[PDB]
Specification:
Chain B: This is Probable proteasome subunit alpha type-7. By secondary structure, chain A is of the alpha+beta class. Chain A contains four helices and 13 strands. In chain A, helix 3 runs antiparallel to helix 4. Chain B is built from three helices and five strands. The chains are: A alpha+beta, B alpha+beta.
Amino acid sequence: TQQPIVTGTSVISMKYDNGVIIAADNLGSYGSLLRFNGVERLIPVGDNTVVGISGDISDMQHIERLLKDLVTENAYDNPLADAEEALEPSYIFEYLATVMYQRRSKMNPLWNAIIVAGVQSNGDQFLRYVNLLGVTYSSPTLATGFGAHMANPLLRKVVDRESDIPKTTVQVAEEAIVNAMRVLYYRDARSSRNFSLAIIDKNTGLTFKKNLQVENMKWDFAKDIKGYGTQKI
Amino acid sequence: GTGYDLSNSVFSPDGRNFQVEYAVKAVENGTTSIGIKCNDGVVFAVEKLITSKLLVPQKNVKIQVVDRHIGCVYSGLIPDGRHLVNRGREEAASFKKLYKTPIPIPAFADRLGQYVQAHTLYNSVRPFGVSTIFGGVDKN
């Protein structure tokens, strides 16, 4: 049994017609103090998988080390390590899902909420969630912590069910992700303006975007608000 | 008298370990392999005896990788060579876990060196029937 010390907030993701999009901000919160600003919380595994981790940062860096060892271990005595016998998003998830459940059963959990985003070798979109309890689920849209309350309602307006996936383009999907990041910056007190975005497509491959900022904010209406009830000036 | 060659960790009257010398005979019998150090890297090459046409070409890989920067090739008893690489991979992972940086080649050379030397200290273990050529690029 432990407690989270340095934490990372929401990880938001959705699937479109040709692949998946995942995003997470670059913040490392120390309670109420926004201590670290150069923290990458999206970890690319190979060229077909990106792992988005929220929660405890020290535990995140441990999982980050485990994934790098998985790539090293897969390349051992494997002539097709970059072809047929390459690491699939489903292989990477199932391994993590096994670890998360084994740790909670020993009463020493990895204090994280993880979303594995990627594209399978046959072109299928992969998007699955796993938390500290080992609870696993798949959905057209996935979000951890605070995003599960705010980003999910916004992303489900674009893709409500399975049939809405082939109708959704990269442009519409990314716009919904970028908009959700702004809304999270509006209402989450543990969120940062700077964020990373990753697109895994079955045609263009992996596109990792760094140092993105929340733009087009509405703050002008604040000048008209004075007092809390009866104050006029 | 005689019989100094029957047990592993036994010194002969002339300060030799015959069981180790017999392990060399297993290497000399095996397939030839080479390593060449160039100006900024290393190149490993090995012969692959085609026993029959039934052997699938380009499949029975002999050269092995340790970590992501070290390559190993060996002559003699192939299963013994695989066991040494299995140990080396664990040894390289143990180094990277504690020290973060990938294991240096002279560092990795001693790790295998100590492990093989250990199999000459006891009569309950058999010496390795392999000579391993290995290397790679590190900090310097």
